[PDB]
Amino acid sequence: GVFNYETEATSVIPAARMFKAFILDGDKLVPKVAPQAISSVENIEGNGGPGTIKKINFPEGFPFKYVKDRVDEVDHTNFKYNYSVIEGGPVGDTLEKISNEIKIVATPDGGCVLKISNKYHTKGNHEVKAEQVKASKEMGETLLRAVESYLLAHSDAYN
Numbered sequence: 009g010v011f012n013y014e015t016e017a018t019s020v021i022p023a024a025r026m027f028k029a030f031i032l033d034g035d036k037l038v039p040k041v042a043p044q045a046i047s048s049v050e051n052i053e054g055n056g057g058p059g060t061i062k063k064i065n066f067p068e069g070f071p072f073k074y075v076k077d078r079v080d081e082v083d084h085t086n087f088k089y090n091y092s093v094i095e096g097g098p099v100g101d102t103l104e105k106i107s108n109e110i111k112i113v114a115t116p117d118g119g120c121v122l123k124i125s126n127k128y129h130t131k132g133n134h135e136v137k138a139e140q141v142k143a144s145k146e147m148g149e150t151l152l153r154a155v156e157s158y159l160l161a162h163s164d165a166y167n
């Protein structure tokens with residue numbers, strides 16, 4: 009079946025800029041600013057639209073060596089990004105796939121809020137504990153704060 013988890017994260021950076029830096033060009037920026045969490049991102053095939061497959065490689069010592077993301081949908085206008093984890097780690101073992109949605113919304117103070125939705129499609133009767141998924145939240149937060157710090161220090165980037 010499916011386990012649905014949702015979380016939110018806030019940022020002081022405006023939505024359009026965060027969307028462009030973190031999501032659209034995250035395969036280039038994240039490995040640069042957060043090498044301790046993502047060693048590299050490889051484009052397997054596609055040019056960025058639906059069907060694009062990317063391989064996310066993790067640093068030595070991490071539990072899983074890599075996962076592959078497949079881009080499902082991209083709304084450059086309302087800042088919505090849908091992608092699926094289709095291979096690697098537990099996927100293919102206890103999970104069939106993970107479907108995620110990221111929506112970035114502007115706040116009146118000039119910042120933004122990232123609304124994250126994760127749907128874990130399990131295999132058989134495996135249970136995904138809400139406590140075990142906290143690891144994806146912390147990873148998410150780490151990457152976000154690293155990109156935010158970079159964007160505050162380089163005003164000319166991703167304008």
Ligand SMILES: C[C@H](CCC(=O)O)[C@H]1CC[C@H]2[C@@H]3CC[C@@H]4C[C@H](O)CC[C@]4(C)[C@H]3C[C@H](O)[C@]12C
Nearest residue numbers: 030031034035038064077106108126144148151
């Ligand atoms: C695979 C996990 C979590 C999956 C889940 O548990 O729901 C997610 C959590 C944060 C994700 C990263 C966010 C920043 C980047 C977004 C890019 O567009 C694709 C590469 C990066 C580096 C993403 C790679 C991968 O998609 C991660 C590391």
Ligand SMILES: C[C@H](CCC(=O)O)[C@H]1CC[C@H]2[C@@H]3CC[C@@H]4C[C@H](O)CC[C@]4(C)[C@H]3C[C@H](O)[C@]12C
Nearest residue numbers: 066070071072097098102136140141143144147
């Ligand atoms: C905890 C769940 C579910 C595990 C299960 O049901 O067996 C799994 C599913 C996908 C897993 C993530 C895959 C991407 C990353 C791999 C890294 O090497 C460790 C951190 C991350 C972010 C993993 C954290 C955690 O291991 C998750 C979120």
